[PDB]
């Protein structure tokens, strides 16, 4: 249930391609070669069998940079010694698992002991262990692979670390990993499509970048070897710190990630995918990067499955497949020629004029031929004359026939070519075809796909479709993958082929299709004749001009740009949506849908994202009429053409939320280091009467710029009342606005916008479909924002949270769940030089603008965001949210933390790579307690600032703040009014005599209580007293509390309203305990009397704990503790009762509830075993009075131990403390100990007492090691 | 415990004029600080206040483009410099408190100030 | 923009009667203020946070409410206490205090 490790650190050397080089474990005779093959300094982890770290273990080339594969289980531990033998020091952050504080890899504002912070810097020589605990949370989930994907790596400086090595590999499986696992057949190949970076290495002083895999660059990988017709395991790490992504293909096989199909292996940042493939064929295979961008020469590698010996039970697969059904496949008749037409890119064209954006890309001249081209396309045709042409249709140019086809069903594709030029057609997605009637090849042709048909050629292709390349019952019925030609991709892609390919699942039939195409017409075919029949000018020349492109890469949807596609579907119509992305593009586009909400991996999302080469399968209900835009969410485009509109068109109470859009003065960053900025914000209101902003505390306290939530069921209603202040005009869009059937006549497109200064009211009906599911969790995000400009002014600052909770479980006056403590985090990049309000920010007085960068959760920088505080036990909602352009891929990670996601299953994850636009839900409960930090694990975010601390508490630590005993000095408590002689120093709880407590005439009086330290405070106990019969106290007050100096705001914890009040004393002997389940975090903290009873008279005491919740019971009194580990030097035994060492707990109670020892002598003792190693801040002590006879302890010294012979007493100031104890039975007396003390036995001796020894006790204390 | 004013003056209509509010034995920075106006008619009328920790103050609606507020940390005392004086300017100035913390209300007051609208 | 009625605005009261005056006002408010001008004279506090009397009141005041209506009770007035009385809101900016109010015993 423990295994064991060690490592290391070394610097060497590395190239990039030759192999051999990753074992200088024994000299070699190579130093003579010196010679292009390139070379660099890098550092990595290294690991040794044995504990004096000499013992160099061997590894294989596969691995490359990877450090050595680490293995656990649930119910486990794993115990590794780091040595840092190299130059930087180095630390190790981990993913995954549990770990103490005492083994994190980072140090942040913490407020934490240095002994738990030694762990986050490992620097040479040296050792530093670290630990760590894969407790019961941490495991796998049911429809989750045998193993997850974890890793490891050091955490001292990301943008250095992880470009000069520093990385690792941890898989985590559940029980059921001891197996012998077939060594000739799971493999599980571990891969690392890192992208490395020299240019800001540790060591460097202009350099060059790299996309490597796991090391290798140009096909350079070797170890590669999978048996035949078995699968094997795919664990893929993706880094790289700079952010980008590596939509990855096998050449001939798709994936299983999930449990949808997948062609490409789309990373970004730092992704954790498992994805599993059968390896049906035999021979070698490439792997490589498909980006438009060729930088990625790369991240390409060579695979070779082979033969080998001798399927146990390993997540056997799972897209079964028989007979459920009735009909037979059909074979398909299908005729197409790749013929020449000319294409106009708007044939709705209009307006004429010069500083237009549509004027450059359409607007025919003498010079742009902008409108009209010459291309070629796939033409359907009905026969084998090939002269009669299938219907052609609109919404759906540019573009070949639709082909269709189930599984097993039959294709027969019949190419003629009727071109200028030799043209190729070939499908993607499927993994089987060849020409009809025969099996092999032409001449030289290694592999059909790169083989042209020649201008007049007739060729018979014959498309089969198996099952491995389709569904598996839990994608959509029809995913989308492309054909066109293969003898020139990027070109003929450019020219015009293209066509769309269906495979679907039997247990206008398939609708309308959509493709998002950068059609790069400067790389056609029919360029330079293009020119000759179109231009009015031949010898144009001077094309090498980077406006001459920008010309007429015509950004377009389908073969329409501006405005120019007018597809139209009915209301209440359900419509597929078959969406693609092919063409130069690059990157990734964030797609969307004006006022409409889309159903993509069987849950709902708001934006889909679209990688390039990708094909993406959804599809939507029809309930919301009007006239609706698209869109691409990606910035530049769009402007630049990519549009085309919808026209649809047709053929128990309400929850109240005034809503107003103001303006404040931001500072990101006032701690650490200052400029205020300018930004535009929403604000929870009271009224239409826009005079009280509903003030945001404690429960909204980490919102900061954020919007305010609006809750709301389902099946219930959303009254969204919304002025406007401001200066320009902005509006409120949520795409869960559902006008009704208004204005007929024709489609109107839809108004929102208002105008500065005016008022616009929305109101419409939750439907089911925004709700969760019932697979979904308790309430799914939503997105909503302004639609003037939704670029801009979302770098303006207009933003917040829409939630659906679903089913009767948003109660109470409330309006929250209130069984859940609810946050959200807004991960994105801000520039201030887009936004509306950037001109008036020349706040100085008379060039690079890299400091309006700012990488900011909720809009806070570098830990300073506060009000992240959740309970211990406590289920947590997390919502993360991306937004902004497509450098926003943020690798979301909580410190230590693990988290759950809901996408039709349930699966575990610890990074989340959030995508622009997608608002998706997660949920997790928290086991270790402190302060953990929040970041976004791209290597150039985190130093950028993008990071924020969250505290999770201790429930049950509750200890006398101070006040009683004198714990709190004299010195440390202040007040204003005072009367006389009724000084705020005497409101010390359970203190009397003459005067004894603190009173005021004053009005508007309160007092200060200074804690010298953030504490957390978890309740205020409140008196009052007497004089002579009068009783005096206070009947009702509020709370003030600050952290600095004079950042003071108000309470307002658990809703109710504006703050909360609090109930005071009603006599004056009476306690009154006034906890608050949303704690305060403070040290200075005050009270202010709003109803007094004659006088404000107030006699009190504070419940609280340090910032790190030590200071627990550990299970004496609740009896967690069992007796087996609670003894003595001996017991008073005898016949009349038994004084076990077991009954000594506080509180016990009985006619024997003490420990007394058989003889009384300043020699006897108390022992206490723990079983494991544990903490210890202070001890609590309390007498029994049996009979009439008082028997307590007056004094005690204290010792600790870590076995069970050896004894180290508790030392302070110079001797050994004398801790004095009880001065009657009942009252308990703690003494915190100081400095707290990590141990596993703890002892405690009398020195002095009464009548006889006698005792009952529990141990403040804290877990650890 | 007091707030002593200075008082009245006398002036034309649309000039320059400072009045003053000397503290009373407390720490004066720490506390905020009103100006009221009070017509021979009307109930009161709002002037605005000055967070005087470091002095940032603000202003009412009513009254706009014709006032001011400044300080004198050393004799804790804040002041009204009434520039283009217009006529009906002709009301009661005072001075107010509302404590340290939460919800700014007034604690004291004291003697006044009027001389408008003088001939 | 936030409005005080005072209501009513001079009453003839009454050597010992319940009197009350309300103060609704059209932006609604958590936490209410009253004060005393004992015939143009430097104001003072009387009733603060909604109810409870200040140091230096005779008891025979009080009054209380919440949110749109608040009110002022007297149980036996004395021309002692007859002056004139405005009601102070702080929930927003401005602070528009009260119109007018009365006693005439």
């Known amino acids: 249930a423990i295994r064991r490790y060690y490592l290391g650190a070394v610097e060497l050397s590395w190239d990039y391609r030759q192999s051999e080089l990753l074992r200088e474990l024994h000299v070699d005779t190579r130093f003579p070669a010196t010679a292009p093959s390139v070379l660099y300094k890098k550092t990595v982890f290294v690991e040794f069998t044995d504990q004096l770290f000499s013992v160099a273990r061997p590894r294989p080339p596969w691995m490359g940079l990877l450090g050595p594969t680490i293995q656990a289980e649930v119910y486990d531990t794993v115990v590794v010694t780091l040595k840092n033998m190299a130059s930087h020091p180095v630390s190790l952050h981990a993913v995954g698992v549990s770990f103490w504080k005492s083994s994190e890899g980072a140090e942040y504002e913490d407020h934490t002991s240095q002994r738990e912070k030694e762990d986050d810097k490992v620097l040479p020589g040296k050792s530093q262990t670290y630990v760590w605990q894969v407790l019961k949370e941490n495991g796998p989930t049911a429809s989750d692979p045998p193993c997850l994907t974890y890793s490891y790596l050091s955490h001292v400086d990301l943008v250095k670390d992880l470009n000069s090595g520093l990385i690792g590999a941890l898989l985590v499986c559940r029980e059921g990993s001891l197996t012998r696992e077939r060594t000739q057949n799971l493999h599980e190949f571990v891969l690392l499509f890192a992208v490395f970076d020299e240019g800001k290495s540790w060591h460097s002083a202009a350099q060059p970048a790299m996309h490597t895999v796991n090391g290798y660059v140009n096909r350079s990988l070797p170890g590669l070897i999978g048996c035949h017709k078995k699968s094997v395991y795919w664990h893929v790490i993706g880094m790289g710190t700079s952010p980008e992504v590596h939509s990855i293909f096998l050449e001939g096989h798709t994936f299983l990630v999930r449990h949808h199909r997948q062609a490409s292996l789309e990373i970004s940042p730092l992704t954790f995918l498992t994805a599993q493939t059968f390896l049906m064929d035999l021979g070698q295979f490439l792997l490589f990067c498909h980006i438009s961008s060729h930088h990625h020469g790369g991240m390409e590698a060579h695979v070779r499955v082979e033969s080998c010996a001798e399927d146990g039970d390993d997540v056997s697969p799972f897209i079964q497949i028989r007979s459920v059904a009735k009909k037979h496949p059909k074979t398909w008749v299908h005729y197409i020629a790749a013929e020449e037409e000319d294409w106009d890119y708007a044939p709705l064209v209009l307006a004429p004029d010069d500083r237009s954006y549509k004027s450059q890309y359409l607007n025919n001249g003498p010079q742009r031929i902008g409108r009209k081209y010459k291309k070629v396309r796939f033409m359907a045709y009905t026969d084998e004359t090939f002269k009669t042409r299938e219907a052609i249709q609109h919404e759906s140019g540019i573009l070949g026939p639709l082909l269709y086809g189930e599984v097993g069903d039959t294709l027969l594709i019949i190419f003629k070519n009727q071109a200028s030029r030799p043209y190729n057609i070939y499908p993607h997605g499927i993994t089987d075809v060849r020409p009809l009637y025969s099996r092999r090849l032409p001449k030289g042709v290694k592999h059909l796909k790169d083989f042209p048909i020649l201008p007049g050629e007739i060729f018979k292709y014959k498309w089969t479709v198996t099952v491995e390349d389709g569904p598996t019952k839990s994608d959509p019925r029809c995913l989308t993958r492309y054909y066109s030609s293969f003898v020139n991709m990027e070109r003929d892609l450019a020219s015009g082929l293209i066509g769309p390919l269906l495979i679907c699942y039997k247990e206008s039939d398939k609708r309308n299709v959509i493709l998002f195409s950068v059609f790069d017409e400067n790389r056609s075919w029919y360029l330079t004749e293009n020119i000759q029949r179109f231009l009015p000018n031949p010898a144009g020349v001077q094309l090498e001009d980077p406006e001459f492109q920008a010309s007429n890469i015509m950004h377009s949807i389908n073969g329409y740009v501006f405005d120019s596609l007018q597809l139209s579907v009915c209301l209440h119509e359900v419509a597929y949506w078959y969406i693609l992305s092919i063409g130069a593009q690059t990157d990734f586009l964030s797609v969307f849908f004006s006022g409409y909400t889309f159903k993509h991996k069987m849950v709902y999302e708001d934006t889909l994202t679209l990688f390039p080469f990708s094909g993406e399968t959804v599809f939507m209900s029809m309930e919301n009429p009007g006239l609706w835009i698209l869109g691409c969410h990606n910035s530049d485009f769009r402007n630049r053409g990519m549009t085309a509109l919808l026209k649809v068109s047709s053929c128990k109470r309400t929850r109240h939320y005034f809503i107003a859009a103001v303006e404040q003065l931001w500072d990101y960053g006032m701690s650490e280091s200052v400029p205020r900025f300018k930004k535009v914000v929403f604000r929870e209101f009271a009224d239409g009467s826009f005079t009280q902003p509903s003030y945001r505390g404690e429960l909204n306290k980490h919102l900061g710029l954020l919007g305010p939530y609006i809750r709301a069921e389902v099946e219930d209603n959303i009254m969204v009342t919304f002025k406007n202040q401001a200066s320009r005009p902005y509006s409120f869009y949520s795409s869960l606005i559902s006008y009704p059937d208004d204005q007929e006549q024709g489609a109107e497109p839809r108004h929102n916008f208002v105008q500065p200064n005016e008022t616009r009211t929305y109101f419409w009906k939750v439907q089911h479909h925004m709700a969760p599911t019932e697979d979904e969790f308790d309430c799914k995000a939503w997105a909503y924002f302004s639609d003037v400009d939704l670029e801009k002014d979302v770098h303006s600052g207009l933003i917040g949270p829409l939630l659906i909770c679903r089913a009767n479980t948003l109660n109470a006056a409330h309006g929250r769940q209130v069984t859940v403590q609810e946050f959200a985090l807004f991960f994105t990049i801000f520039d201030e030089t887009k936004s509306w309000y950037f001109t008036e920010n020349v706040e100085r007085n008379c060039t690079l603008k890299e400091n309006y960068r700012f990488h900011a959760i909720n809009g806070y920088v570098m830990d300073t965001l506060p009000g992240l505080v959740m309970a211990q036990n406590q289920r947590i909602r997390w919502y993360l949210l991306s937004m902004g352009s497509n450098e926003n891929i943020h690798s979301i990670h909580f410190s230590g933390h693990v988290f759950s996601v809901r996408k039709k299953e349930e699966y575990k994850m610890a990074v989340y790579n959030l995508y622009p636009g997608v608002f998706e839900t997660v949920e997790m409960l928290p086991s270790k307690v402190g302060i953990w930090r929040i970041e976004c694990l791209i290597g150039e975010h985190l130093q950028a600032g993008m990071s924020t601390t969250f505290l999770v508490y201790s429930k049950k630590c509750q200890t006398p703040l101070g006040m009683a005993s004198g714990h709190i000095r004299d010195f440390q408590i202040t007040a204003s009014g005072q009367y006389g002689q009724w000084a705020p120093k005497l409101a010390r709880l359970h203190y009397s005599g003459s005067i004894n407590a603190w009173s005021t005439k004053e009005p508007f009086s309160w007092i200060k209580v200074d804690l010298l330290a953030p504490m957390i405070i978890h309740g205020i106990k409140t008196q009052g007293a007497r004089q002579k019969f009068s009783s005096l106290y206070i009947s009702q007050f509020i709370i003030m509390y600050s952290l600095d100096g004079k950042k003071w705001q108000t309470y307002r914890g658990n809703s109710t309203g504006t703050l909360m009040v609090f109930f005071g004393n009603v006599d004056s002997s009476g306690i009154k305990h006034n906890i608050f389940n949303p704690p305060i975090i403070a040290r200075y903290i005050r009270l202010h009397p709003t109803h007094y009873s004659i006088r404000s008279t107030l006699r009190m005491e504070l419940m609280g704990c340090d910032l790190n919740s030590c200071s627990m019971p550990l299970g004496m009194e609740s009896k967690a503790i069992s007796d087996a580990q609670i003894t003595a030097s001996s017991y008073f035994t005898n016949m009349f009762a038994t004084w076990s060492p077991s009954k000594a707990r506080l509180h016990l109670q009985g006619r024997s509830n003490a420990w007394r020892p058989q003889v009384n002598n300043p020699k006897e003792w108390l022992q206490v075993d723990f079983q494991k190693t544990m903490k210890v801040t202070g001890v609590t002590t309390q007498g029994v009075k049996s009979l009439l006879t008082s028997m307590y302890v007056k004094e005690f010294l204290i010792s600790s131990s870590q076995d069970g012979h050896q004894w180290t007493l508790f030392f302070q100031n110079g001797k050994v403390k004398v801790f004095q104890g009880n001065q009657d039975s009942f009252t308990p007396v703690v003494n915190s100990l100081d400095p707290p003390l990590l141990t596993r036995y703890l002892r405690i001796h009398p020195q002095s007492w009464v009548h006889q020894i006698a005792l009952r006790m529990e141990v403040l204390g804290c877990e650890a090691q | 415990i007091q707030l002593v004013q200075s008082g009245p003056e006398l002036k034309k209509p649309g000039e320059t004029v400072k009045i003053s509010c000397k503290a009373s034995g407390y720490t004066f920075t720490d506390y905020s600080m009103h100006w009221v106006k009070q017509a021979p008619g009307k109930g009161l009328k709002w002037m605005g206040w000055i967070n005087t920790e470091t002095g940032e103050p603000t202003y009412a609606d009513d009254f706009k483009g014709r006032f001011a507020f400044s300080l004198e940390t050393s004799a804790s005392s804040a002041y009204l410099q009434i520039n283009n004086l217009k006529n009906e300017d002709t009301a009661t100035y005072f001075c107010?408190?509302?404590?340290?913390?939460?919800?700014?209300?007034?604690?004291?007051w004291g003697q006044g100030t009027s001389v408008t609208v003088s001939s | 923009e936030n409005v005080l009625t005072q209501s009513p605005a001079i009453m003839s009261a009454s050597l010992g009667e319940k009197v009350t005056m309300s103060c609704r006002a059209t932006?609604?408010?958590?936490?209410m203020y009253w004060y005393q001008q004992k015939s143009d004279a430097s104001p003072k506090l009387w009733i603060f946070?909604?109810?409870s009397l200040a140091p230096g009141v005779p008891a025979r005041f009080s009054g209380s409410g919440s949110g749109n209506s608040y009110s002022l009770t007297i149980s036996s007035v004395e021309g002692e206490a007859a002056a004139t009385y405005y009601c102070q809101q702080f929930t927003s900016s401005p602070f528009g205090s009260g119109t007018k109010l009365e006693i005439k015993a």
């Open positions: 107010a408190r509302c404590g340290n913390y939460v919800d700014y209300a007034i604690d004291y």
């Open positions: 946070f909604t109810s």
């Open positions: 932006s609604s408010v958590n936490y």
